[PDB]
């Protein structure tokens, strides 16, 4: 709060003191550079909460979305939320994909690439068939399942982006 | 803080200022309408943190639980935590469920229903058998695996609700 | 703020009031026991936010990492983040693991152990083979797949710790 | 210890002499700036031991851990302890790794980097095949096996951090 | 040091003051509970050195030795020193050792066991052949060479004893 | 500390008492024969630590370096640190090295020699070929690969100095 100096032999002393006290008390209820119990405010700086935090409303985190056909007709839908990326496998296998082969049609952007190699467990529509796609630090996904030419790939979950 | 007005020719002014300064200083340490570094306090309003937030304790978010048999002895345990719902597949298959057929025993409530169709990858006890159940915006879960009459379904993970 | 008492007939009164006001005003901008809109600060106590919280930076939660060979050559990488534990299946199956048998090489620590039984769905490299590992409150993992002696286990996701 | 001056014509001399003797004697058993034969203590400075140092409990040095996929599915796990790095090679070759090629997915961080080129000898599961991976001071690891597109590389050992 | 009280009107004051100064001064050179720059001394407690510790003499850590025939004629010799185990592979393969098989004559004792699987690379005399032997935390060693029924396995190195 | 005698009828007593207290108090902070929690100090004698010794700075042991051409173009580089020797194999095979033959250009000096035969496993650049070189206590190294007349031998690790 902007306050005036109080000194000996001051003209309008009581007036100055009152205005200084009112300016300080105004910041105790609303505005200024102080966080309040009421009202919509913006907070800057590294805040460390040693105690337990409870949220009754909604917690908003930075969000970024991406979708593309990795290779052979497999479309992966990604959605970043803080330090966790939510994956969604979809589409239909059009061309024959070899076992332990790289998907070169579309590469995963660097902002979605994890530090450690993550495995995305999926299921093939029709039978008891299972598959997993590995995401390296580079971005070139690999089909770790057997040689397949046709089928429906499905699978939704989460994978970490940070490790060490 | 509740403060008294200071004016020229005020009776007992020294006490008035002292009481006003003490009332303000009391709110600087505890209570009032300001958030303190010490003590348990309740905060209201939209708080936008532009900086980095670090929590050493426990984070609490709105929680709601649901459990019920989807169809043919397949019980799904759901728990919502803000924008992410945790799923758990349990039970044992009693009746015959057709391939690419809808489970009509009990539907998933709207508060647990995602915007887009989510696939829940699971594993059958005994063999290398795998299955996935799709959750549409309607609520009626669909078995996307092949025709089965017996087996133990298992699978635990997380699925998004917004997108 | 450290403030001095104001009384009637006070020697050097003007200075005392000014110093008290300046000390209070200093705490309104930086330091003290109050939380500010700017600067790196540490907050203690149970804080309840009734409104909507928005984070633009990074949210940090208590983190603990663990890695070890559960049994038969299967190495599980666990990383705790608040109330959710992130799992990662890796390694190579060296010795024969029986169907519905307990993994006795290394047990999951109690701090990573969930309240309920969680199924971690995985995939075997080379075929359409799937498997799930159950983790109880004790820590002794169970291989619920068929009797396997060789193969590459893979799988990454998240599982709840509380119920 | 904090002592008081003793001098001729001093007031309450015997008390001051006694208080000083007690203050000094206290530090011969615990605290102050002296290292003792009991107690948990932090010691600063360059301590040069010209004799025999015998550790019966534990000797704990600075430790740091790191793991990453170097390239081609090869995973290197590291633990720095003092002036030595403990390594473990794992994973499985996923794609063609050309003879004498740099592994270009992830480099070894500078804090784990050696002063000179370190040749880490390894073995491929299921045959008599050996290879090596060089860690240069830059941390850009290099494969010195022949061209390989599959297999399971292994090897545990150490390399030094200074020269 | 053991000292006597000094007080006003004390009998034999100068002597007591001197005796105390001497008792205290004695412990600045040897004995008592103080660590000195000379002498053989035993030190209890957690001693954290934040600076540079330079050892010119010897550094002696907890040591233990063990040797045993793991199986198939393969002999492993170990020496634990602190948090590290020094190993040496010897003997001669006497019988058929199947690829990826457990060596089931003798296991490594728990006190020599690592926290994680340790891959000990070795070489067979007289050719270009390499192998490895895994020591898991259980101590049941495993042969990762191919099937072998003869030859001389060798290899010296170290493995660690703990992990976070 | 160097102190002076105190006695009945002494000349300049208060001064001597004070000088003594100051001389003694001085050594509780620095110098004399006491080890302190600060400062660069040299410590003689057998120091046996029964508790946990934690080094946050550096731990420096006796070090010595050596390199030489063992024979046939094979160069061995060594660094002794305490009871451990760090090695690095280099050079290029220049001439025919017979299977199981002694490398007779230069031996490892006695101060770098082990108590027992040490088998140093290595790899040849560009193929899957491995070898080993034995360092006996005499320091006359022995090649345990087959007969070789060319190639690039590599391998970094350690061996111990006593048994």
């Amino acid at each position: 709060a902007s306050i005036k100096k109080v000194y000996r032999g001051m003209k309008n002393g009581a007036e100055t003191i009152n205005d200084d006290l009112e300016a300080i008390n105004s910041e105790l209820t609303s505005g200024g550079n102080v966080v309040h119990k009421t009202g919509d405010e913006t907070i800057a700086g590294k805040k460390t909460f040693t105690g337990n935090v409870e949220v009754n409303g909604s917690l908003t985190l930075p969000t970024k979305s991406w979708s593309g056909e990795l290779g052979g007709g497999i479309i992966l839908s990604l959605r970043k939320k803080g330090t966790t990326v939510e994956y969604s496998i979809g589409g239909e296998i059009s061309s024959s994909i070899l076992a332990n082969s790289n998907l070169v049609n579309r590469s995963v952007p660097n902002e979605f690439c994890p530090r450690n190699r993550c495995s995305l467990v999926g299921h093939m529509v029709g039978g008891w068939n299972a598959f997993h796609i590995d995401i390296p630090s580079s971005g070139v996904c690999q089909w770790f399942g057997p040689t397949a030419s046709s089928g429906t790939p499905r699978g939704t979950g989460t994978y970490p982006i940070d490790s060490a």
Side-chain angles (χ1 to χ4, degrees), chain A residues 1-114 116-164:
Chain A
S2 184
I3 51 94
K4 292 176 279 174
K5 283 185 82 72
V6 180
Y7 53 89
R8 180 173 162 265
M10 186 170 79
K11 189 187 170 194
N12 309 325
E15 287 77 20
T16 312
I17 298 157
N18 187 229
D19 291 324
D20 289 325
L21 286 165
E22 281 179 324
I24 284 164
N25 195 45
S26 184
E27 277 198 347
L28 288 166
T29 55
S30 58
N33 195 52
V34 56
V35 188
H36 289 98
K37 290 178 184 181
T38 49
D40 297 19
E41 289 177 324
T42 316
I43 309 100
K46 195 259 183 177
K47 304 288 173 184
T48 313
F49 294 92
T50 53
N52 296 17
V53 188
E54 190 176 301
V55 183
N56 295 11
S58 61
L59 208 147
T60 317
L61 286 165
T63 321
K64 202 178 180 287
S65 301
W66 183 86
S67 188
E69 186 196 64
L70 293 169
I74 308 158
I75 303 99
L76 186 75
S77 299
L78 298 165
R79 202 172 72 103
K80 190 193 168 286
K81 268 197 168 179
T83 53
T84 316
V85 187
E86 303 169 314
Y87 70 94
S88 186
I89 315 154
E92 194 72 34
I93 308 157
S94 60
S95 62
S96 185
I97 312 153
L98 282 89
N100 301 316
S101 66
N102 289 253
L103 289 91
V104 292
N105 199 290
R106 197 87 156 87
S107 297
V108 173
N110 199 47
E111 58 270 30
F112 289 94
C113 288
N116 59 307
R117 212 160 189 261
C118 298
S119 306
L120 319 178
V121 187
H123 177 249
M124 291 276 279
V125 182
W128 304 110
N129 302 317
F131 67 93
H132 96 84
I133 309 153
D134 273 329
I135 314 163
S137 301
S138 60
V140 184
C141 291
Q142 287 188 243
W143 173 265
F144 270 79
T147 314
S149 59
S150 59
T152 318
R154 292 283 186 272
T156 316
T158 52
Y159 74 95
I161 199 157
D162 57 300
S163 59

